[PDB]
Amino acid sequence: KLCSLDNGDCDQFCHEEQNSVVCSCARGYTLADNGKACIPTGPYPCGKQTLE
Amino acid sequence: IVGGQECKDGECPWQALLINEENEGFCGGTILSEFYILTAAHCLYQAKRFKVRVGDRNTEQEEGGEAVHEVEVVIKHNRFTKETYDFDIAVLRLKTPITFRMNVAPACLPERDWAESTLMTQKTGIVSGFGRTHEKGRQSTRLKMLEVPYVDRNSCKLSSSFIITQNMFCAGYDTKQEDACQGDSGGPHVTRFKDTYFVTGIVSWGEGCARKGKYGIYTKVTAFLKWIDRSMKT
Ligand SMILES: O=C(Nc1ccccc1S(=O)(=O)Nc1ccc(Cl)cn1)c1ccc(-n2ccccc2=O)cc1
């Protein structure tokens, strides 16, 4: 079911390359080693409310 | 914003406010990056010269987190028309970069296909602004937000006296008294996914505000992603 199954376990963008799940992130985020999570690069990444 | 709730500290950091010569807000915007603001093309005809304020939550007094930015270049979609309100989108490049901080951060731009299949299919989105809290009233002094349900595209076309183009989508309530309103135009409509907020719409128009049998109309950001990327480069 890939991307249709809970967003392919992706944090953000989910695509299908060669009938396989491929995750990606928005600008300012780097794909984690597990190829699923999105890690911010600065203290104010996009889409995150500022709570501190 | 009619109904909804006040934006608490840090909850709507991507909200931008276009202010006229009198330093009063007349439209909203969404922060996309340190140099760019997304808003509605029809807002450009609400004031000759305007600036952009970010980090504001209460227009009554200055707390110290607000920042005003002058607009360097205005990029309005050439196809926008007041006769249809289609292609209601514009991008503003600022003269100086926005400094991100508490209450000041960009909303994420999603990819097209993913957004349409994963974000636009969610049950709700969030709209915000310093707009009127009633169809008849003055601009709110406090930034508000409202969870608005995505509306079936056919049900909304049938409920509208104006043609809903493919560059538009509907969100809101049929009878419940909550909706965006005058002044919220150009503002953000974001959809949450795993605690990350992506810009999905631009407050565009509506027949009155929160009227029974009527919905809020927004510009579909996914129909202009290529246009936006281009504009953020030119
Ligand atoms: O200004 C408008 N509405 C209004 C009217 C009386 C009072 C208060 C408001 S409001 O501006 O406060 N409403 C809003 C604005 C955002 C949202 Cl999401 C909900 N309601 C409006 C703008 C454009 C159209 N329209 C659409 C297509 C072709 C021609 C055309 O004219 C219709 C109406």
Side-chain angles (χ1 to χ4, degrees):
Chain A
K1 209 165 184 296
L2 307 173
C3 293
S4 296
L5 207 195
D6 191 34
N7 198 48
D9 212 23
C10 303
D11 254 22
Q12 291 175 21
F13 313 144
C14 196
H15 268 297
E16 295 174 0
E17 288 176 53
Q18 309 300 301
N19 190 53
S20 174
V21 172
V22 176
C23 312
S24 57
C25 318
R27 287 176 287 292
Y29 286 96
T30 301
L31 186 69
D33 288 359
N34 58 25
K36 299 181 173 178
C38 294
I39 307 175
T41 58
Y44 293 105
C46 64
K48 294 299 188 182
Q49 295 173 306
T50 62
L51 312 311
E52 76 168 6
Chain B
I1 303 295
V2 178
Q5 294 283 176
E6 175 181 282
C7 281
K8 298 301 179 185
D9 217 357
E11 304 193 315
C12 307
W14 33 78
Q15 176 76 225
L17 183 64
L18 321 197
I19 53 177
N20 60 187
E21 301 162 53
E22 309 294 68
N23 281 176
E24 74 182 305
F26 59 86
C27 274
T30 304
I31 299 169
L32 302 181
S33 67
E34 60 189 359
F35 279 108
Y36 295 94
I37 303 293
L38 179 70
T39 188
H42 78 267
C43 295
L44 305 175
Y45 305 76
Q46 311 293 59
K48 285 66 180 180
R49 274 197 57 173
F50 64 89
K51 299 175 188 296
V52 180
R53 183 187 299 156
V54 297
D56 200 2
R57 286 203 300 136
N58 187 179
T59 59
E60 294 178 61
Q61 72 286 68
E62 183 178 2
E63 67 135 310
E66 308 85 353
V68 171
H69 288 265
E70 289 183 40
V71 183
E72 192 178 83
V73 189
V74 179
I75 301 174
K76 63 167 183 178
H77 204 292
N78 54 47
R79 292 190 171 184
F80 173 71
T81 299
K82 302 178 183 301
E83 295 287 357
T84 61
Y85 262 61
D86 196 8
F87 299 97
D88 195 14
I89 176 176
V91 168
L92 314 174
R93 180 188 169 69
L94 307 174
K95 204 176 189 312
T96 65
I98 292 166
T99 63
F100 302 139
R101 55 162 281 134
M102 186 64 81
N103 293 304
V104 187
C108 304
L109 277 167
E111 300 195 321
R112 185 194 66 183
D113 292 351
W114 182 74
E116 290 176 352
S117 70
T118 316
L119 299 176
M120 317 243 80
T121 56
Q122 299 280 125
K123 295 199 69 62
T124 69
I126 302 299
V127 61
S128 61
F130 292 76
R132 298 173 178 168
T133 60
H134 299 290
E135 182 170 341
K136 290 185 177 184
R138 189 66 60 180
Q139 304 281 178
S140 174
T141 58
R142 309 187 81 66
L143 178 58
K144 301 177 69 180
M145 58 171 284
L146 171 71
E147 185 187 79
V148 292
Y150 272 105
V151 182
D152 180 69
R153 188 167 167 77
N154 218 65
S155 298
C156 63
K157 293 168 74 72
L158 203 295
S159 64
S160 180
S161 65
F162 299 102
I163 298 174
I164 304 297
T165 70
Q166 283 198 140
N167 291 315
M168 307 166 200
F169 78 85
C170 307
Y173 295 104
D174 190 302
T175 64
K176 194 184 190 311
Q177 297 305 84
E178 295 190 301
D179 187 15
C181 197
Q182 180 75 60
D184 292 314
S185 282
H189 171 286
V190 296
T191 302
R192 183 178 74 70
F193 188 70
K194 296 188 180 302
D195 305 315
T196 298
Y197 297 70
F198 296 81
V199 209
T200 39
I202 302 165
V203 179
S204 186
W205 61 273
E207 299 183 60
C209 302
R211 290 181 178 173
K212 187 280 182 179
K214 299 291 179 176
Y215 298 106
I217 314 300
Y218 302 74
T219 299
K220 192 165 61 191
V221 173
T222 55
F224 296 103
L225 293 172
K226 301 80 192 67
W227 185 87
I228 289 166
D229 282 339
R230 290 204 297 279
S231 297
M232 289 176 78
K233 291 182 172 60
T234 58

